[PDB]
A paper describes a structure:
We have solved the crystal structures of two of the three isoforms of lysozyme purified from Pekin duck eggs (DEL-I and DEL-III). The duck egg lysozyme structures have the basic fold of the C-type lysozyme characteristic of HEL. In general, the duck isoforms contain approximately 20 amino-acid substitutions (of 129 positions) relative to the chicken enzyme, and were thus considered to be likely to maintain essentially the same fold.
One of the crystal forms of DEL-III was also of interest as it crystallized in a cubic space group. The reason for this is related to the fact that position 100 comprises the additional arginine residue. Numerous phosphate anions, present in the crystallization condition, can be modelled, including several at crystallographic special positions (corner of the cube at the threefold symmetry axis), which act as crystal contacts that help to glue the crystal together. These phosphate positions are contacted by the guanidinium tips of three pairs of arginine side chains (residues 97 and 100); each pair is projected by a different lysozyme molecule within the crystal. DEL-I and DEL-II also bound HyHEL10 with a similar affinity, which represented at least a three orders-of-magnitude decrease compared with HEL. In contrast, binding of HyHEL10 was essentially eliminated altogether in the case of DEL-III.
Residue numbers in the entry: 1 to 129
Protein backbone atom coordinates (compact mmCIF):
# COMPACT_ATOMS: atom_id res chain seq x y z
CA UNK A 1 0.00 0.00 0.00
CA UNK A 2 1.17 3.47 -0.79
CA UNK A 3 -0.32 5.79 1.79
CA UNK A 4 -1.08 9.42 1.18
CA UNK A 5 0.53 11.88 3.63
CA UNK A 6 -2.68 12.69 5.53
CA UNK A 7 -3.93 9.06 5.46
CA UNK A 8 -0.65 7.99 7.04
CA UNK A 9 -0.74 10.85 9.58
CA UNK A 10 -4.21 9.73 10.64
CA UNK A 11 -3.17 6.05 10.91
CA UNK A 12 -0.05 6.85 12.93
CA UNK A 13 -2.11 9.14 15.23
CA UNK A 14 -4.67 6.34 15.76
CA UNK A 15 -1.91 3.86 16.58
CA UNK A 16 -0.44 6.08 19.34
CA UNK A 17 2.66 7.58 17.76
CA UNK A 18 1.96 11.25 18.44
CA UNK A 19 4.49 12.36 21.04
CA UNK A 20 5.71 8.78 21.55
CA UNK A 21 8.75 9.24 23.79
CA UNK A 22 8.43 12.97 23.00
CA UNK A 23 8.43 12.72 19.20
CA UNK A 24 5.45 14.66 17.75
CA UNK A 25 3.51 13.07 14.89
CA UNK A 26 5.15 15.10 12.12
CA UNK A 27 8.47 13.42 12.92
CA UNK A 28 7.04 10.00 12.07
CA UNK A 29 5.30 11.15 8.86
CA UNK A 30 8.46 12.94 7.69
CA UNK A 31 10.58 9.89 8.49
CA UNK A 32 8.24 7.68 6.46
CA UNK A 33 8.31 10.05 3.52
CA UNK A 34 12.06 10.00 3.25
CA UNK A 35 12.59 6.36 4.16
CA UNK A 36 10.02 4.74 1.87
CA UNK A 37 7.94 7.34 0.08
CA UNK A 38 4.99 6.11 2.22
CA UNK A 39 5.22 2.65 0.60
CA UNK A 40 4.69 -0.39 2.83
CA UNK A 41 6.17 -2.61 0.08
CA UNK A 42 9.52 -0.67 -0.12
CA UNK A 43 12.60 -2.86 0.24
CA UNK A 44 16.28 -1.91 0.05
CA UNK A 45 19.18 -4.39 0.04
CA UNK A 46 22.51 -3.65 1.85
CA UNK A 47 26.10 -5.06 1.61
CA UNK A 48 25.98 -7.05 4.95
CA UNK A 49 23.26 -9.16 3.37
CA UNK A 50 20.56 -7.26 5.33
CA UNK A 51 17.51 -5.61 3.84
CA UNK A 52 15.34 -2.71 5.01
CA UNK A 53 11.58 -3.36 4.97
CA UNK A 54 8.38 -1.41 4.76
CA UNK A 55 7.19 2.10 5.36
CA UNK A 56 9.87 2.81 8.03
CA UNK A 57 12.63 0.70 6.36
CA UNK A 58 13.23 -1.53 9.36
CA UNK A 59 16.52 -3.47 9.07
CA UNK A 60 16.76 -7.31 9.04
CA UNK A 61 20.11 -7.50 10.81
CA UNK A 62 18.77 -6.10 14.03
CA UNK A 63 14.95 -5.94 14.01
CA UNK A 64 13.11 -8.58 11.96
CA UNK A 65 13.55 -12.03 10.49
CA UNK A 66 13.76 -12.38 6.71
CA UNK A 67 15.33 -15.88 6.69
CA UNK A 68 18.41 -14.70 4.71
CA UNK A 69 20.38 -12.18 6.75
CA UNK A 70 23.52 -13.43 8.51
CA UNK A 71 23.81 -12.76 12.24
CA UNK A 72 20.21 -11.46 12.48
CA UNK A 73 19.03 -10.59 15.99
CA UNK A 74 15.32 -10.06 15.08
CA UNK A 75 14.72 -7.92 18.18
CA UNK A 76 11.11 -7.09 17.19
CA UNK A 77 10.30 -10.82 17.01
CA UNK A 78 8.54 -10.60 13.66
CA UNK A 79 8.96 -11.89 10.14
CA UNK A 80 10.10 -8.99 7.93
CA UNK A 81 7.19 -9.91 5.59
CA UNK A 82 4.70 -8.55 8.18
CA UNK A 83 6.33 -5.14 7.57
CA UNK A 84 5.29 -5.29 3.89
CA UNK A 85 1.59 -5.49 4.72
CA UNK A 86 -0.86 -2.69 4.10
CA UNK A 87 -1.86 -2.49 7.79
CA UNK A 88 0.95 -0.71 9.59
CA UNK A 89 0.06 -2.00 13.04
CA UNK A 90 3.05 -4.32 13.29
CA UNK A 91 5.44 -1.79 11.78
CA UNK A 92 4.36 0.79 14.37
CA UNK A 93 4.78 -1.70 17.22
CA UNK A 94 8.34 -2.43 16.01
CA UNK A 95 9.11 1.26 15.49
CA UNK A 96 8.13 1.92 19.10
CA UNK A 97 10.56 -0.76 20.27
CA UNK A 98 13.32 0.73 18.09
CA UNK A 99 12.83 4.15 19.49
CA UNK A 100 13.08 2.61 23.14
CA UNK A 101 16.48 1.01 22.14
CA UNK A 102 18.42 4.11 23.27
CA UNK A 103 19.06 6.25 20.20
CA UNK A 104 15.53 7.77 19.87
CA UNK A 105 14.63 8.51 16.24
CA UNK A 106 18.32 8.68 15.36
CA UNK A 107 17.68 5.05 14.42
CA UNK A 108 16.29 6.42 11.12
CA UNK A 109 18.96 8.02 8.97
CA UNK A 110 16.35 9.74 6.78
CA UNK A 111 14.96 11.33 9.94
CA UNK A 112 18.44 12.63 10.84
CA UNK A 113 18.89 13.84 7.31
CA UNK A 114 15.66 15.65 6.58
CA UNK A 115 13.45 15.88 9.65
CA UNK A 116 15.62 16.59 12.69
CA UNK A 117 15.76 20.34 13.35
CA UNK A 118 12.99 21.23 10.93
CA UNK A 119 9.41 22.30 11.51
CA UNK A 120 7.94 18.85 11.35
CA UNK A 121 4.42 20.16 11.94
CA UNK A 122 4.26 20.91 8.23
CA UNK A 123 3.92 17.14 7.67
CA UNK A 124 0.50 17.14 9.36
CA UNK A 125 -0.69 20.48 7.80
CA UNK A 126 -4.09 20.04 6.13
CA UNK A 127 -4.81 16.65 7.72
CA UNK A 128 -8.02 15.92 9.56
CA UNK A 129 -6.55 13.20 11.87
Amino acid sequence: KVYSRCELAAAMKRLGLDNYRGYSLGNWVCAANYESGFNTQATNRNTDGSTDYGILQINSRWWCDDGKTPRSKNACGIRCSVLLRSDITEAVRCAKRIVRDGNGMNAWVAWRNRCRGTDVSKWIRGCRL
